Structures are given as structure tokens and as C-alpha cells.
Symmetry: C3
Subunit: 318 residues, 3 copies
């Protein structure tokens, strides 16, 4: 049968990639046509060779790729990078997650920024974009999930077709919650609740609501993972991020609204201090809380701390 | 019937867009997939819901879009922007124009730079491009009109199919003259004639030759309308214009010809003075004459004057 | 018949292009859709109007174009430029080459960088790319030839279909050797052997192994021909080359490897001295040896010397 042939086969990568893909700070490289294979490899190792039908999975991946836009940061490369960070978390916390969760989270990460224009929720609201009229909160994130469902509804694209309806509904809910959690506006309240539950010892992974929160923080950790790469990667990625932000700032100016210094290209000299404030307020607390809950995710925090030190070095002019 | 269903329907935009689209200094935004709807909205309001068959119009618009190139300035965004300026002129001078003229001028504006490579007529002549051998004068503009006719000749693309042959020939002549008028080389003689006719009182909109001249000036006013936007928009658009000019200057250097300082990237520091000279010699007289002939177009002149003041501020280093 | 209609026809270019295409320092221009016609013109003049079936040749050219990537330097424009340099060599040494060689070399030049990603053989080895596992030496070049054969194998794409199998095998070997020779790592040993054979007088174009070496040097000369253009062209092309090199340097840094100063964007100030060293060590000896073997190729050396003088002028700050 088809599933019998797939069970005998094993998908493989080049030697360097096979070894280094297990590291949290792995970079997927500049060869775009290798990314689909990298994702399939990660799915096969974290879930199994029988989790998805290979022909359907490949069809799904290519359609997801087609629905990411040619923008500096929120692009196809970001999607696969976020998926890799989730893979590394999953592999280092392997006993904790169900088959459905491992299936759902990797797919959620791949789809989490689908059809991103490179503009924030704030900008879409101020422009009065039709999406803002449809989705009052988490505007882009609700759209990302809508795009995901639409791709799944295409003929030959339902990668969850072998699942029961019950399991199908469960995995789609996992995906929905995970994608919505990537709205950074929701992260601050989530992390604060998680910190309190951890300190009191009330935090329980057997409680679904608690489990959803931890998954939410995992999604934030994967989404921001550029700060957990080695310095050369982190610094170069920052160029892509600001390219998008400054473009939005330009568009804000076109609306007759003065943008925040973060999005203002006239204030390039304040970037090192701006990054310092981001690491202190957002990045460090995120990976600190995640390391407390899931100790094997420690390398993410260490790398984040190392990059914080690098930004301090830039400020001093060293 | 089909026209009966279209009569009952009404096309609408978001609240902010509906209000601000009436302003001369309106910016169409960075969301490309909203531009077709913006154009249809303008056609529906200025001409009527029964002017074009909606399915044919949408098919036409998408083909026009496909025939604009990925260049910094002379692109799809420019086409819709020029069309909007015409819409604002039409709406503020509503009693003056026939149904054919309102139909023709919006379409002429949308099509006026079709298949633009980002090079001037001068460059094509010096390169010895096949287009220069076919069209001795107004090389690109004659090509733009040829592209327009070719798109109209495609199956299901004749948006003027319900018109009589007489009316069809009239609208195509309106379109031809309007597009040819966007050759800035022809503007100087046109404006000079219009100024004389206005001052003597011989200018008569009931005279076809006079009417053609006024339409010609309207086309120039719409074409140069980036100088009538608010300062942030005007300044950012200037970056796109010079990107094209400097690229042409590079190509001129490749032919062994020293380009004019306007097209020379080595003379970036002279841009503010170069803009000052352009406003004084071309932009201000254009909108002054247009305001004299059509007083409701006054906001274009005011905004042009405001931008002239801004460039003077740049020169002083303020 | 079809070949009879083709014999009566003659393909022509604009006046300036017809005259200046014969010069070694000719630039093909910024009009992409003119390049296919330029190539066909060169084939018709150097080989003949009966060398290729026009419909098949055009189909081949467009497929080759489709298989070049949107990279700053190793792109479709480079391919046609390299082909032109070969045309100029062929036309100025017309009595030396067979019909098969003239056919093969122009096609080899057009196909010599097929599917180039903008990365060196060194980078692919260090990244551990699948291509490096398949091709241990001349990694990209062996791939370029593989792409060439694949395009030829497509239905209606065999431009050599009228040739006997014997002649077909001969032309494919000419193409293979020519493309492999564009590996600059192989140039140094080739030029050294050619210099020795020329000085002793053992060099004999009637000897196939010697002939292969001369063709190899011709390929190097055509590949590096940007240094033989006029200064404005040479200087602007250098921007495209470094764009690719610095991108590779960035990727090297992402692997945790410090790139050589050539590929390091942090060392932009050393470019003029870096170019000086390249002209002295690689470019000048290449065209000197080629001029010794084929004296009509002298204009390439003169132009290379002129550009060397220009780089020296940059260093002095003049
Ligand atoms: C919007 C998305 O969810 C993500 C949001 C966070 N993100 C970033 N990741 C790593 C580094 N930087 C990221 O975005 C920024 C987050 C914060 C800043 N902060 C500031 N930057 C500046 C720069 C100049 C002047 C003031 C400021 S304040 C700048 C960029 C990636 C995109
Ligand atoms: C060719 C098209 O019909 C249009 C021509 C006019 N156009 C412009 N609109 C707004 C602002 N600038 C436009 O183009 C220019 C028109 C004039 C100049 N003038 C000069 N600019 C410089 C810059 C440096 C040194 C000397 C000079 S002279 C520069 C640009 C948009 C394109
Ligand atoms: C890889 C391909 O076969 C070709 C290799 C040679 N090539 C060039 N042609 C003309 C000019 N430059 C070319 O590539 C270079 C060849 C040598 C250098 N040399 C150096 N450049 C620098 C710059 C800064 C610091 C040190 C150095 S050393 C730079 C670029 C075109 C591409
Ligand atoms: Zn997002
Ligand atoms: Zn994201
Ligand atoms: Zn134009
Ligand atoms: Zn225009
Ligand atoms: Zn090559
Ligand atoms: Zn090459």
C-alpha cells in the first residue's frame, strides 16, 4: 500500500544539516528550494513517517509557500525558521506532547504569518483596512488562521484527512490558538499569568487552559527566535525587521500621523538603544519564563543574553 | 437582466477612504489589491453604475495592471494615482463634462503610462530603440496608446462595446489626445497658448480645439500630481522619481554620453535646487493656469505652493 | 520548404546596434526583450541563417532565459554579454573555427551560468549543498552543463536535431569543455600551460588538446569581459559583482566562518586595491596570453589596461 511504501522510506538531509538542525541556533540557509525538504525532515523526526501522506504534505507546503509575500521579514523564510525553533523545543521536550500537538504546532508555525503584508495591526486599523473591520482584535493573526483553513479546504490539500472528525477539530483548535498567540499584544498578559502560576506551583500541564498558555509562550519564543541565533545572524535579521518597520513608518507619515521612533527611519541612530529596551522588556522575560517552565529550552535564553551583551557593545562604540 | 442587477448594487469603500478620496491630496495607500476597487468606486461615482459592465471593467483593469512594469515610479500605482487626480477634477467640475469624456478621461489616465520601461523619449532615441524608429515624436506616449487599443481588442475586454460606433470613435479620440498630451514636451506650448486665450477671453470650452487644450492641461496636472500631495508623500515620491532618472543617467553613461545633472547620481546634493527650478518653471505655472481656467482646482495650486516652500526650507538647511 | 523560407529572410537590428555590435566593448543595453534578437543576429552572422531552425532556436533561448535566476550579476544579462564577447572573438578570427565550433561556443556562452544562485563553489562546499556531494570539483559548472543538456532534451528544444549523431556528440563535447573551463580555478593552470607552449612554439591549433586549451582561455576572456568594457560600464558592473560577493560573505558569517575581505561588506574601502590586485594577477595575464595566441583580440587587452589605469586613479583619490 501507499502507507507501507512510506514506512520503508526515510527522508535524509546533507551531513552538516542533519547534525546542526538539532541546535536551537540553526540557520536554514539561503537555498529556498531546500526549505520544503528541511520541514518534511523535521515533521518525520518529531512526529513520524506515518503522520502525513507525503504527496499531500508536499502539495500543502508549496501552497503555503505561494501564499507568503515577497516582504523583507514576514516571509517564507521566517515561517520555516519559526517552525524549526518549534521542532527544537518539541525534540528537547519529547515526552510532554501528544501526536496531535506535534502535528499541529509545526503546521501552525509554518502557517502563522500567511499572507502578511509587512504591516502591523495598528497600521491596518489606522488605514481603515477591510480586515480591521472584520477582525477588531488580533487582526492579522485571525487572517493568518483564515488563510490556513482556506488552504486546507483546497482539493488534495487536507493533510489531516486520515484523522477522525474529533481529532480534526482538536488539531484545528490547537492551530487556531497557537496562531492567535503570536499576536505580541497578547504575550504580555500571558507571560504575567504564567509567571504567577509557576511561582505558586498552580501551573499544571494536565490542565488544558494552563497547557494552552504554555503553548502560547512557546509560540512567542519561536516567533521571536531571531534574537536567539548567533550574533551575525541576529544582526543581519535586524536589517530585515527595520526595513519593514520603516516602510510602515513611511506609510504612517503618508496618513498624516507621526510614527513612533521604532518605525521612523530618521531615527536610525537610536536602533541600538531601541534593541536594548526590547531585549530587557520583551525578549529576556519571554525566554526566562519559558526556561523556568521548560528547562531544556535554556539555550534560547543563553543566546538571547549573549545578543543583549552584543547590543550593549554597539552602544559603547566597541 | 445583467444591467438591472448592476443598477440595484452599489460599490462601497471603508469609511476613511470614502471621506478622504474626495480630497485632491488623497493617497491610494500601499495595499495593491485595493486599487482596482478604488478605481471602480471612482468610475461609479463620476460616471454612474451603468457606464460600464462590471465584469468587463474588472477584466480590463486587471489586464491594464498586468501591462505595467515593476519600475520605481512609472508603475501601476502611478496610473491609479493619476486617475484619482482626474476624478477629483471631474467631481469638482461636474457640470462641464459629457458622459463620454468622464468615461474616456478616467480610462485614459489609467492607461497613460502602459508598458513604461522607466526611460525617457530622449534615451530611446539615443539608444536607437525600435519604438523611436516607429514613432518620431512622443515616442512612449504613442506606444502607451497603442497598448491601450491592443488591450481593448482582447476578447471580453471592450468596455465600450455598448457604445455606438460614432461614440466609440469619439471616446477613443478623447483617450488618444489625452495620452499624447502627457508628453511634457508638448505641455509648454499648450500652456502658453491657453494663457493667451484666457487673458484675451477668446478661450471657449464650446470650441473643440480649445476644449482639447484644456483637457491636455488637465492631463499634465494629473500626471505631475505628486507635487500636490502633502509633504511626506511628495518627498517620498521624489525618491522613486530620481531612482528612475539616475538609472537612465547610468545608461546614458554606458552609451558614452554625459547625462544632464538631473539624471546624474553623482550630483545628489543639487536635488533640492533642481526641484526648486522644476516648481518655478513647470509645476507652479501648470497649476496656476489650470486654476485660472478651472477655479475649483485651486487646492492643487495651494499644495504645490506649500511643497515649493518645503524645498526652500531644505536648501536653507532648516 | 521551411529552410528555403529561412534562407530568403534576413534578421536585422537598429542602425546603431548593427554598427556597434562589432566592437568588443559593446554593451547590450537595458531592454531585456531585445537580447534574444541580439543573440539570433549574432548566430546568423557568425554561423549562418541555415545553422539553426529559427522556431526551435527561439524556443531554446526563452527556456534558457527562464532558467537564469534574478541575481545581481550571474543573470540573463551576463549570459548574453558573455555570448557577445565570443561573437566578437569569432568574427575577428573567422578563418580558424569550424561550423560546429561556432555553433557550440555561442550556445555554450549563453548556457554557461544556467541556474546560478549567486554563490561560489567554495560556499556550496562549506554549506554542504547536495550539488557539492554530487560534483566534487567545478560544482556549479558541472551543474550548468547538466541544465544545458536538460533544456536540450525538452520537446522541440533540440537545436542540434539536424546534425548527425557524430556531429551532435562533437558539439556537446565542445559545449561541455567550454562551460567547465569557466571555472576560474582551472584558468590559472590552463594559462600557464598555454604561455609555455606559445613561447616554445609547440602550441598547435591542429592538436585537439591544444585547441581545447585555447578555447578554454577564450571562455575565461569572455566570462571576465566586464573589465574590457568602457569605464562607466566596468565601474557599474563592479557594483553588481560585489552585491553578490557581499551576500555570500553574509552567508559565510551565518555559518560561523569569517569570510575573505573580498566577500566582506565591512571592508568596502579596500575595493579599489582589491580590484588592482585582481587586474594584475588575473585579468591582465588572461588578455595578454589571449592576444599572444589570437592577435585580433588586442582591443580586449587595451581596454583592460585602460580600466587598470582607472582603478589606480581611484586609489590616489583623483
Ligand atoms: C511584529 C512581529 O510580531 C515581531 C515584533 C518583534 N520583532 C523583533 N525581533 C527582534 C528585534 N527586533 C524586533 O522588532 C523590534 C522590536 C522593538 C524595537 N524597538 C525599538 N527600536 C527603535 C529604533 C529607533 C528608535 C527607537 C526604537 S524602539 C525595534 C524592533 C520581530 C517582528
Ligand atoms: C517624465 C515624467 O513625465 C515626469 C517628469 C516630471 N516628474 C517630476 N515630478 C515631481 C518632481 N520631480 C519630477 O521630475 C523631475 C523634474 C525636474 C528635475 N530637475 C532637476 N533635478 C536635479 C537634480 C540634481 C541636479 C540637477 C537637477 S535639475 C528633477 C526631477 C515626474 C515624472
Ligand atoms: C566568480 C566569477 O567567475 C567571476 C570572478 C571574477 N569577476 C570579477 N570581474 C571583474 C571585477 N571583479 C570581479 O570579481 C572580483 C575579483 C577579485 C576581487 N578582489 C578583491 N576585492 C576586494 C575588496 C575588498 C577587500 C579585498 C578585496 S580582494 C574582487 C572582485 C566576475 C565574477
Ligand atoms: Zn505574525
Ligand atoms: Zn511571525
Ligand atoms: Zn508618461
Ligand atoms: Zn505618467
Ligand atoms: Zn560561472
Ligand atoms: Zn559567468
Amino acid at each position: 500500500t501507499s502507507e507501507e511504501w512510506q514506512g520503508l522510506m526515510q527522508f535524509t538531509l546533507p551531513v552538516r544539516l542533519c547534525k546542526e538542525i538539532e541546535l536551537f541556533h540553526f540557520d536554514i540557509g539561503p537555498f529556498e528550494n531546500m526549505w520544503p525538504g528541511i520541514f518534511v525532515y523535521m515533521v518525520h523526526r518529531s512526529c513520524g513517517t506515518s503522520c502525513f501522506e507525503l504527496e499531500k504534505l508536499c502539495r500543502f507546503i508549496m501552497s503555503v509557500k505561494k501564499n507568503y509575500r515577497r516582504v523583507p521579514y514576514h516571509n517564507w523564510k521566517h515561517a520555516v525558521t519559526v517552525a524549526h525553533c518549534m521542532y527544537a523545543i518539541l525534540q528537547n521536550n519529547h515526552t510532554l506532547f501528544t501526536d496531535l500537538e506535534r502535528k499541529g504546532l509545526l503546521i501552525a508555525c509554518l502557517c502563522h504569518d500567511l499572507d502578511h503584508r509587512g504591516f502591523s495591526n495598528s497600521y491596518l486599523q489606522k488605514f481603515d483596512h477591510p480586515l480591521a473591520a472584520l477582525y477588531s482584535t488580533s487582526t492579522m493573526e485571525q487572517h493568518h488562521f483564515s488563510q490556513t483553513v482556506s488552504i486546507l479546504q483546497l482539493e488534495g490539500h487536507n493533510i489531516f484527512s486520515t484523522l477522525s472528525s474529533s481529532e480534526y477539530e482538536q488539531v484545528l483548535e490547537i492551530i487556531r490558538k497557537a496562531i492567535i498567540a503570536t499576536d505580541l499584544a497578547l504575550y504580555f498578559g500571558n507571560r504575567k499569568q504564567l509567571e504567577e502560576m509557576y511561582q505558586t506551583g498552580s501551573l499544571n500541564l494536565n490542565n488544558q487552559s494552563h497547557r494552552d498558555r504554555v503553548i502560547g509562550l512557546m509560540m512567542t519564543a519561536c516567533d521571536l527566535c531571531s534574537v536567539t541565533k548567533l550574533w551575525p545572524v541576529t544582526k543581519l535579521t535586524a536589517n530585515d525587521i527595520y526595513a519593514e518597520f520603516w516602510a510602515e513608518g513611511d506609510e504612517m507619515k503618508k496618513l498624516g500621523i507621526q510614527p513612533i521612533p521604532m518605525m521612523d527611519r530618521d531615527k536610525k541612530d537610536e536602533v541600538p538603544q531601541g534593541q536594548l529596551g526590547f531585549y530587557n522588556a520583551v525578549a529576556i522575560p519571554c525566554y526566562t519564563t519559558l526556561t523556568q517552565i521548560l528547562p531544556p529550552t535554556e539555550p534560547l535564553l543563553k543566546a538571547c543574553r549573549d545578543n543583549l551583551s552584543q547590543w550593549e557593545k554597539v552602544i559603547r562604540g566597541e
